[PDB]
Design a protein around this ligand. Structure first.
Ligand SMILES: *[C@@H]1O[C@H](CO)[C@@H](O[C@@H]2O[C@H](CO)[C@@H](O[C@@H]3O[C@H](CO[C@H]4O[C@H](CO)[C@@H](O)[C@H](O)[C@@H]4O)[C@@H](O)[C@H](O[C@H]4O[C@H](CO)[C@@H](O)[C@H](O)[C@@H]4O)[C@@H]3O[C@@H]3OC[C@@H](O)[C@H](O)[C@H]3O)[C@H](O)[C@H]2NC(C)=O)[C@H](O[C@@H]2O[C@@H](C)[C@@H](O)[C@@H](O)[C@@H]2O)[C@H]1NC(C)=O
Ligand SMILES: *[C@@H]1O[C@H](CO)[C@@H](O[C@@H]2O[C@H](CO)[C@@H](O)[C@H](O)[C@H]2NC(C)=O)[C@H](O[C@@H]2O[C@@H](C)[C@@H](O)[C@@H](O)[C@@H]2O)[C@H]1NC(C)=O
Ligand SMILES: *[C@@H]1O[C@H](CO)[C@@H](O[C@@H]2O[C@H](CO)[C@@H](O)[C@H](O)[C@H]2NC(C)=O)[C@H](O)[C@H]1NC(C)=O
Ligand SMILES: *[C@@H]1O[C@H](CO)[C@@H](O)[C@H](O[C@@H]2O[C@@H](C)[C@@H](O)[C@@H](O)[C@@H]2O)[C@H]1NC(C)=O
Length: 257
């Protein structure tokens, strides 16, 4: 069984076989999303990921290796098999390494690296290649709000016209300021009680998030979750904290018109 999708990652750019060339060994790169065949990836039961009839292929199996296009039958079986874990990683199970966009720019070549749960290692397999713009509603049915670069995020009464309450949910599993998409919801550290702020997107593990099945927003590296500090909205502090199941750790996205 198979299905075809784009693969969206860092900065909303897509996995692209350079200029539609399919010569074995051509590096895969980031490029703005489109519908051309060199961004259309077919996922099959054999765990291959194919474009133009050739495979997404690990050029070697150690950290820092290139990912390239390659003839499926002549490439090593270990090099051409991939899985897609629920948290947005794309993993080569033979090596345990994960697909990585080591820099943000278009034309960045993609690498296989040790998983560090970086935003540079988050991907979304989808035909919708535009970020989803949403409100993020939490404790006391208030809305998460941005308050400028380098400042804390916090909760306020929802307002449909408030630009500061609008979030672009990018394919790399980042949560961006919708009006200023170079800025990311960022934990200022990986320890319990570290503050959530807005910082320039830099592909960091502190900028990667996962909306889990329990209503939590999880930072995969820390394992900790977004938390309205001390269940007190007047503190105007959102932190990471261990998952407790409490209402101050529950969030829902609401798509905006
Ligand atoms: C798993 O594989 C990963 C991908 O290869 C490894 O990550 C790389 O590790 C490289 C080091 O081995 C690292 O390269 C160096 O990066 C230095 C910093 O560059 C940044 O900052 C610069 C400003 O100061 C800026 O210009 C850059 O754009 C970067 O933002 C850089 O200074 C180093 O260059 C010095 O030394 C070289 C000599 O080798 C000089 O040529 C250079 O002028 C300068 O004097 C160096 O850059 C590399 O230089 C050689 C060139 O061929 C390379 O292309 C160039 O990158 C590189 O940044 C990262 N890449 C990524 C994606 O992170 C990873 O290594 C580890 O993790 C990194 C972050 C680092 O902490 C390493 O020490 C860790 O080992 C691998 N994992 C493991 C466990 O090995
Ligand atoms: C919830 O957050 C509020 C903002 O920090 C707290 O109010 C502040 O409490 C301070 C005590 O450390 C006190 O000096 C301040 O006067 C007060 N207000 C501001 C704007 O700083 C609040 O503290 C308690 O609850 C409210 C209802 C007030 O009665 C306070 O005086 C209480 O100490 C925080 N705590 C709770 C549990 O609500
Ligand atoms: C979120 O930000 C986006 C991107 O800036 C806004 O979408 C743009 O809006 C203008 C006016 O409608 C359009 O001309 C552009 O084509 C849009 N750009 C992109 C990149 O799609 C949008 O208004 C913002 N707010 C919401 C609720 O999405
Ligand atoms: C991968 O390499 C093998 C052997 O070196 C080629 O036979 C493949 O050729 C392709 O598949 C066969 C079925 C035939 O239709 C041929 O015309 C195709 O090009 C090659 N695979 C590709 C996609 O280049």
């Amino acid at each position: 069984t198979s299905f075809t999708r784009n693969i969206v990652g860092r900065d909303g750019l897509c996995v692209d076989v350079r200029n539609g060339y399919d010569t074995d060994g051509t590096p895969l790169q980031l490029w703005p999303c489109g519908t051309q065949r060199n961004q259309r990836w077919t996922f099959d039961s054999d765990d291959t990921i194919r474009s133009m009839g050739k495979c997404m292929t690990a050029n070697g199996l150690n950290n820092g290796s290139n990912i390239v296009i390659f003839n499926c039958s002549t490439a090593a079986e270990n090099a051409i098999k991939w899985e897609v874990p629920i948290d947005g990683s794309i993993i080569n199970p033979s090596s345990g390494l994960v697909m990585t966009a080591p820099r943000a720019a278009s034309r960045t070549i993609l690498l296989l690296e040790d998983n560090i749960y970086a935003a540079s290692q988050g991907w979304t397999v989808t035909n919708n290649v535009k970020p989803i713009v949403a409100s993020i509603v939490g404790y006391k049915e208030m809305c998460l709000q941005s308050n400028g670069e380098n400042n804390g995020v916090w909760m306020e009464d929802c307002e449909a016209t408030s630009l500061q309450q609008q979030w672009a949910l990018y394919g790399d599993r980042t949560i961006r300021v919708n009006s200023t998409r170079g800025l990311c919801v960022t934990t200022n550290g990986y320890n319990s009680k570290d503050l959530i702020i807005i910082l320039k997107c830099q592909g960091l593990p502190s900028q990667r998030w996962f909306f889990n099945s329990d209503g939590a927003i999880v930072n995969p590296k820390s394992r900790l979750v977004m938390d309205v500090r001390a269940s007190n909205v007047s503190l105007r502090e959102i932190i990471i904290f261990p998952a407790t199941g409490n209402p101050n750790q529950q969030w829902v996205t609401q798509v905006l018109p």
